Amino acid sequence: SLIKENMRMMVVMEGSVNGYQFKCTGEGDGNPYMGTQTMRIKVVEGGPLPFAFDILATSFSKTFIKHTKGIPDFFKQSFPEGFTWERVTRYEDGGVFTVMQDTSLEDGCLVYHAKVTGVNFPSNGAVMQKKTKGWEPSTEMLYPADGGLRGYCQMALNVDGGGYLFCSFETTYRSKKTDENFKMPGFHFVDHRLERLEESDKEMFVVQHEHAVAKFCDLPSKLGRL
Amino acid sequence: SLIKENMRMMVVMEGSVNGYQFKCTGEGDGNPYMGTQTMRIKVVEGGPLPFAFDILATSFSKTFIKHTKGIPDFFKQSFPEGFTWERVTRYEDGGVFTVMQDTSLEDGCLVYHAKVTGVNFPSNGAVMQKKTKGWEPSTEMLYPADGGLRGYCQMALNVDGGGYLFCSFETTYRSKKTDENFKMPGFHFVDHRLERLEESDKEMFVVQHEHAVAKFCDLPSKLGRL
Numbered sequence: 053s054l055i056k057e058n059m060r061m062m063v064v065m066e067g068s069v070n071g072y073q074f075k076c077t078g079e080g081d082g083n084p085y086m087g088t089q090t091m092r093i094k095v096v097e098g099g100p101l102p103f104a105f106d107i108l109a110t111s112f113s114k115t116f117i118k119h120t121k122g123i124p125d126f127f128k129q130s131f132p133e134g135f136t137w138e139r140v141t142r143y144e145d146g147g148v149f150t151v152m153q154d155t156s157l158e159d160g161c162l163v164y165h166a167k168v169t170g171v172n173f174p175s176n177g178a179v180m181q182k183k184t185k186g187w188e189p190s191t192e193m194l195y196p197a198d199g200g201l202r203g204y205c206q207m208a209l210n211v212d213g214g215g216y217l218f219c220s221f222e223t224t225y226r227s228k229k230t231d232e233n234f235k236m237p238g239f240h241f242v243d244h245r246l247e248r249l250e251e252s253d254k255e256m257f258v259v260q261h262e263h264a265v266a267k268f269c270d271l272p273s274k275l276g277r278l
Numbered sequence: 279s280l281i282k283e284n285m286r287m288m289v290v291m292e293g294s295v296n297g298y299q300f301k302c303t304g305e306g307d308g309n310p311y312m313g314t315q316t317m318r319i320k321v322v323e324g325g326p327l328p329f330a331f332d333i334l335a336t337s338f339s340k341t342f343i344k345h346t347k348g349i350p351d352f353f354k355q356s357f358p359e360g361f362t363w364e365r366v367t368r369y370e371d372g373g374v375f376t377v378m379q380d381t382s383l384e385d386g387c388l389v390y391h392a393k394v395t396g397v398n399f400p401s402n403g404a405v406m407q408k409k410t411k412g413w414e415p416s417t418e419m420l421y422p423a424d425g426g427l428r429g430y431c432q433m434a435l436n437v438d439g440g441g442y443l444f445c446s447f448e449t450t451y452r453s454k455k456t457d458e459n460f461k462m463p464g465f466h467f468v469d470h471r472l473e474r475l476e477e478s479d480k481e482m483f484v485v486q487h488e489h490a491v492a493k494f495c496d497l498p499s500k501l502g503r504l
Binding site: 216272273 | 419475
């Protein structure tokens, strides 16, 4: 199959946050069926960034989700054509981060192109003041909609002092493939845990890891529901 | 302890939806430590309601959450004083459901008083057209805030035709107890599965059941985090 037990990925991210232009590139690898992946990222233009790199974290890889309980895999099924994802993240303090991402497969390497736009981040907020300390894990809720797959997520960002900064997002994943055999998943969840393993040069070099698993609620049901 | 292996509860809910006044009463039983509970509800004023009972479901019981390790029980620790919860649920189609709830313990029985207000529910929406078919399970994300415990949830309501209606809410849980020995939990999740077991008389009688468990993310961590 096109998606092997071990896969490499390359990324280019370009955009702006509060009008500040920047560009990042990255390369990594992972085990798509295990739901694990690692990415080494460099800020190639605009570094050192005047905002917390944490806001870019979720924009740097859907092919690396372990699918349990027979939940159809929207992403792995999309190759060789690939897919796109579009998202809007709203922070509790006004900041909004919108992304349009394209995922392709070239010569056996996954290729990502993310176009990002961050707006209205408060000048004295943790993001613009670089007082963030990584994300907590989260649970995404998904279901078919708008000719694709819709996902909703709520996340908490650790901040200096021991508090948290909340944000939520809605995503629409769209397949570039037109296949009679394509199997669409139904309502389900994806547990995520994105952790920063390393960083250097005022966040101009960052190493991120993510573990993701598609699953159903583990609680028993009185009606025989998933 | 004040909260026993088996507990009963009594509830009174009064308020309005889109200007329509109603009142409900209920009594239930559960096992607080197992995280299970059942409530038998009757609409005593305004029935049959012109809106889907489903929108009231989450307003009818935090004492019934299973706890294993690492997460102190904000709710069970609050007795005998009890606690309150305040919440705002926003539906993707404009409807907003706001609640102020009081939880007390009288003569060994849990007593709930919920004051609710639903506004702007679209006339032709699933709620006002009574085309809803129960909630999917969900995962609530919690952390300390505003002198209490903050909770965020995202829920999907099944609707006639096989689709879903999305909503999300933010809650603030406040303990009525002042105790220097009170242990505040840190960041965690609560998995919920609320199901309707029975109903009759155009929803003038409803039996709901809920299973809830406080937990950390299931996924392993690369950094030894919880």
